[PDB]
Amino acid sequence: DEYVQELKGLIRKHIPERCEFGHQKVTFLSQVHPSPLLTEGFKLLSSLVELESCEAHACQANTDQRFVDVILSDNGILCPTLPKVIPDGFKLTGKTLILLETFVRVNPDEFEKKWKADMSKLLNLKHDLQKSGVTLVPIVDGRSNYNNRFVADWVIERIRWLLIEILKASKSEDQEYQRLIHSLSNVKLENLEHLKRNSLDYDERLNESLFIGLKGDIRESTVREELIKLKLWFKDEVFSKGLGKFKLTDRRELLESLSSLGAHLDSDVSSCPFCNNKLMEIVYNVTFSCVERSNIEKHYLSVLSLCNKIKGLKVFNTRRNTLLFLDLIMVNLMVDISDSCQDAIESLRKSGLIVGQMVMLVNDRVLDILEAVKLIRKKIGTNPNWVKNCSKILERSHPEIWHHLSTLIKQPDFNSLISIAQHLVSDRPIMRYSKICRHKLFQEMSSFEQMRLFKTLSSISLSLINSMKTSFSSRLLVNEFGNVRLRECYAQRFYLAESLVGFLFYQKTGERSRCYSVYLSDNGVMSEQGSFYCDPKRFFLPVFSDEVLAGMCEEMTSWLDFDTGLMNDTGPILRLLVLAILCSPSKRNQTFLQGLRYFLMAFANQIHHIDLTSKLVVECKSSSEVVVQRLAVGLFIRLLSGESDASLFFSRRFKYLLNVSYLCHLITKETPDRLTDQIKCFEKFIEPKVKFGCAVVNPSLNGKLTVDQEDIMINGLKKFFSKSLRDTEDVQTPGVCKELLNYCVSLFNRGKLKVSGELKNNPFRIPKLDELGNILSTYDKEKLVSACVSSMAERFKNLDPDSTDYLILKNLTGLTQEELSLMYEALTEEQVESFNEIKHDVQVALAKMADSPFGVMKEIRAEVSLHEVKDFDPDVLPPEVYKELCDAVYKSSEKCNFFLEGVLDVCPLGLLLKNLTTSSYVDEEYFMCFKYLLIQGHFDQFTNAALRNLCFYSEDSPTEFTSISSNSGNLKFGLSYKEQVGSNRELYVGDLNTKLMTRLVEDFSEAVGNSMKYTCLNSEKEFERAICDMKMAVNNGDLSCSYDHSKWGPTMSPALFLALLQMLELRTPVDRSKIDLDSVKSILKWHLHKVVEVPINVAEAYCIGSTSLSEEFFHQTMQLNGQIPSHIMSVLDMGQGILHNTSDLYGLITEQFLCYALDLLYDVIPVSYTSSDDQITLIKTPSDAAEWLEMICFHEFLSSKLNKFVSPKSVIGTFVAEFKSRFFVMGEETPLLTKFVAAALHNVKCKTPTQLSETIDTICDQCIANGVSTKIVTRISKRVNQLIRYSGYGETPFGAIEDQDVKDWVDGSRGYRLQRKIEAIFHDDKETSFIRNCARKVFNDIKRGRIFEENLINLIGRGGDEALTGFLQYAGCSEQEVNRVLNYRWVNLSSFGDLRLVLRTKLMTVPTLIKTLQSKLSRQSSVASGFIGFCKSMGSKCVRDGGFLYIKEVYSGVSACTCEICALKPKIIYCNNSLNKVSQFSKPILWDYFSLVLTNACELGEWVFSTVKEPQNNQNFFWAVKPKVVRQIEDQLGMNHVLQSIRRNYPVLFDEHLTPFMNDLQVSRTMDSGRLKFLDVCIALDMMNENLGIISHLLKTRDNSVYIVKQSDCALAHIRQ
């Protein structure tokens, strides 16, 4: 015995920490025998691991291995007959359990699967336990390795190695040996030959149902003869009988059909867009009311801001009293202002911020004066001490920094207040809930009122976006049919002119859709403008884009300048259409505009589908879509009412109408409703499966099928492969005929198609699935609650303040009332609700840890007795089954033992329930207190094969597999949706194991396709070839067929791919071995038997509960057969985006076969390009295009015989060819302006102003690449700059991209336009010229002569002033030049680091060049809410120094001192002595200009040193240009070169935070092309400055390489050389 004897001596270095350790060690050491040794060794290992894991959580180790019922019986708990469960550790305290089960899994797959299966089994116990007993916190402590705190982490690996050596040495079955071995390794792809592949007496039926007719060896002449006969039959039995699928256009017929479907004539709506739409009407009213027509105000705004700041601290632990106190302060200061200066209450208020009988208050609230004084009247007489102590409480244990010297303590003089109140009479708002047209005929206004309409729309949209900003946890003082007289309504203001302002009143807070009321105020007289209903988070696009849209509309109008008289009739209607789309955002408008695009495509060409017009019509609702549909259809009929092809100008009309049709990108894509979208997604997923008739209900999820399930699966598979070549009744049904597949495969095998199997490079080299997209899943919620409760329990070594909430905010958002407020204000409304639920759960758990009903007047008998027995616990008890009034009156129960007198904020344990109940009773929240009363009322009331799978045994590991499973699951999936503009797309999310298998098959298919040629899906070279071929074919005038295939996802089946792969051979490159595709076929079978989990929300909505087949199916399977369906397994799914490359390969093979057939039959030359969903076929025909209809119909028929049905959107013609949304016309390419403009105006994802500027720069570069304009990009630049400025960051010299740019986005990077912006700041370019000359001198000195080295780097990191003065003295200067250059300064807020700010992110969580390099080494949220989070987070203590402070505090330290050099660019550039008070936030702009110039010279040549010289065309002649850059930095610039110089210069930064996960340092250390020419200094500059980003541009591609521009802009460019 070599290792057996050593085993006893090796464990001698063990600490007998516990009694059980020694108790088992004495048994171990005194017992040596091969049969019992291994079992007790495993037991000891697992025991020590679990003991350490639990003792990390203050466990009470379960040594007797007893159930939970027995341990509840040991203490005093009634037995509710719970399921029998053995927990690893239990801890009873008070009336709560802490149950934890631990395990160890080396690989992530088993770790995740075990974690899910253990969390579910613990969670299934709490429903039964809480019904008649205690509530438990479940902990699951999983470890990925065996390390612990009891051993030195050196003995465990050695003992495991020797133990597995013993196991593999001596034995005593088949798979248990392999499972023991597999569970002890460390780390461990295809070639799974270790598997067993045991049959099940079922897969044979699969064999003769899938492979009964596949041979793949047919000869060629027989195929030719059969195809000839088939064509002869089709000519005279299907085509001449009118059963085709494609038809000629007949322009007049299409125009009549469009006019009949779009322009409603059966509708009662009038032809005035303003009258039908509410928002449109309000915009019109405000515009035409405005167009045709003092230090106290600053003091009031400042004190209002101070009041908001003091209210943000919530230092009163109550909501009513705080609001009353702030109201008292505001009214006291109002009477203090109005006591003197009698011309104030009517001058700077009626023209400022006040309305009829209402004053603005804290928290953006507007309150009536009479109600305010009435509420202040209360709390007096009963609490005379209410004021004084409050005045005394703001000085002690308070910030004690308040300017309320007299406005605070002052008792409000009610006589003067009531005098002010009676000075003006009631004109309260009305808030209209739930007719002669006088609208001045929009077509007949001047060119000035329209821009005013756009400006008004922008202002109102900004007001809505700001209405989103109100704090969610705010309640009104007094709460509230068709008309309601407002008294405590929220309001927002928007300015229009000197006197009149606009108010926007609303009553609710959050992101939901509301009803707003718009009022005006001219000179104190408050009028009514209107009331409407909208969702605020859908109005972000027009927030400032009042000039971008005007610019694009003017350009599109100018596009029609070939007829003076057509643009005059199409301009105003186009503007009205754009404005109507902006004011009426909905998905139906998007769908209609997409239908318009497809109609245009069909109209331009010559052949189109017979079932096209049925895909254009979208039903109209609310009469707000009828107006936009009428406008769009009228535009289309007014434009394309002429002939086709042969015309003086037709390409311009097509361009204009295509751009009009992409107006649907203006409307956002953000799911108007989430539950509705989930329901629609589930419907779209499940309708075809049940229509086909093969959808089974809940399987076993273990690889076991009953006789009925396998029978229905086999029947479905037979029906799939039961189509004949002759029948025409099945053209739209899924299924593939075996004969044509045999023909295609046999013809592919004998190298006859354009592709063949001569492949090289041989290919074989914890989210819960039933809710996806939910902000916080059940698993995360329970984990968080358990963690918080465990931390609380271990801290109590009771009493508990509210600071516990702070703890929760550590785990939701990643990072002391300031910290709590900053963390709280970063949560969205739904996240706030989830946080409140977690709060309640934790508080209830602790209250339980700490340890009357005959109040019947209208309930208890039927209300709460059935409400508690209703859905789960009262934590989800709806407030609608019980009325509000009865809730309030039932709460009138007196104070008793259930209550306690006093708020008692400190709250010692044992009174949590009573304390929260009393506190919530004091405030307005009554239903929460009712729930608390409910919960306090207790109204919720030696074999080695089976006895070894309990401790750490990885029983669920893959060892043997069958045809339907792998003994490790059934390849579970999930359902979700991905937003698009037209309609949402399916999305399948998979577990880890199924993700690995899909990745394996995906890699194999990707390799096989990469061998082939004609696919263009993940190979840009083939896409470029397709683009060039399309361009030349359209130029020549050949036939182009754009084929978009319908239902590609939910139709194809893994069985089709199984048959195709069974019939293929895929010959090896140089071996000709006929690769065996066994593993691929096994994985494809596993896909064939996959499981898709239905969303839990859809099940709940259909259970609780308009006709739909999905709903009737769900009810039919509800209890008629079994239980609620939760899993759906079927034949034809091919999860969308799961088998993408395999589908591409199949489509390529079938398309090549079809092209061969067309060449064989009609003697044409087809060439096809496929992208796995859409394809383009370019057909060159010998020897006017109406005799090719038969060929097109035959092609469609043959495609339908395979599983490749053609959608009606497909078009065949000769005018325009489409592929991947890139339309080509004879001569040029269509620009698609509006798509790019709408993209630029959208996706404003802001985290820092610099990053926002960079993203907008990239988007604008891509925009100007496709010939948009140079007058539109400036307006987007202004919009981004104004969005930055409005956020409070203040304007900065760098900021967003430059204003007033030129065509020179080409041959210029981000640095060049930064340099241009700085040069534009200085007018006479004197100091800029001097710095440029110094830069040229330094550049020449480093290029030749006195060649320098890394010594210069030592100067860069010192600072800004020192670096500039050192470089000036190196070039050569004196004190005068240095002291003159260092005069210009700009304020750098991020001087001592970065802005401290938290954004609206998702829950559960150094120079930037390091982060970019780290990113290179490796491998749902809306826009308005994100921007509001940005603006709100940049108003708190953000900038750091020394400590944090505001931005306005820093900017208030500057002095005006406008002497000579602070007026060339106000609020941007200052002089030195003007920044004496704030000097640490002051850096020279000339240093950044110097760095920009040097870096630009390093990158794109030396021509950036010269001086700019200004030079001494129908706006429609486009032409293409190339970049004209010259580089001097070894342009190839491969990888592993920057890191070499960084290691040379910054070893400490290379060692730490850089390359931990790096395994090829040998190449990067052996001077791999080290010591570059300029890279020594051209990398240090970016390390210090945060807005150059030259490294990120070094290792990238231009991404455009071409720019289409105008003759108008190239002649206005600036010459610099």
Ligand SMILES: [Mn+2]
């Ligand atoms: Mn297409």
Ligand SMILES: [Zn+2]
């Ligand atoms: Zn009207």
